[PDB]
C-alpha cells in the first residue's frame, strides 16, 4: 500500500488554513530530488511558508509538493519529493504534525 504521508499532509494543511493559521513546511534539504534555492538551506533543512498568499499554484500531490514562491523579490519554482517533507505546522503557535517515517521513503 502507498504511503499515508501525502494524505496526512493535505489534511493538516487544510485544517491549518481553515483555522486561520499559516502553514509552514519543514523540508529535509539533503533528500534526493529536493529542488529549492540554496540560500534556503540552513542546518540541512528548509522552512517554507505554504499559505496561498506566500505561494502560487501550490500542488500537494501524493509524490511531491510543487509551487512558485518569491525570494527577496525573485520568483522561483520549488519541487519537493514527499519523502523530504518532515513536518507541517502553524507559524502562529507551532501546532501541526511531525510525519512518521515510512519504509518507502528509504
Amino acid at each position: 500500500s502507498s504511503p499515508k504521508r501525502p494524505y496526512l499532509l493535505r489534511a493538516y494543511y487544510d485544517w491549518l488554513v481553515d483555522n486561520s493559521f499559516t502553514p509552514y513546511l519543514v523540508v529535509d534539504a539533503t533528500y534526493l530530488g529536493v529542488n529549492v534555492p540554496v540560500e534556503c538551506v540552513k542546518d540541512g533543512q528548509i522552512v517554507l511558508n505554504l499559505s496561498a498568499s506566500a505561494t502560487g499554484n501550490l500542488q500537494l500531490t501524493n509524490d511531491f509538493i510543487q509551487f512558485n514562491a518569491r525570494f527577496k523579490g525573485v520568483s522561483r519554482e520549488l519541487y519537493i519529493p514527499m519523502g523530504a517533507a518532515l513536518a507541517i505546522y502553524a507559524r502562529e503557535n507551532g501546532d501541526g504534525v511531525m510525519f512518521e517515517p515510512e519504509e518507502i521513503y528509504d
Binding site: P37, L48, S53, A69, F71, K72
Partner: peptide, 8 residues
C-alpha cells in the same frame, strides 16, 4: 520561512 510573505 525562506520565502517572501507575499508571492503576488
Amino acid at each position: 520561512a525562506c520565502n517572501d510573505e507575499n508571492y503576488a
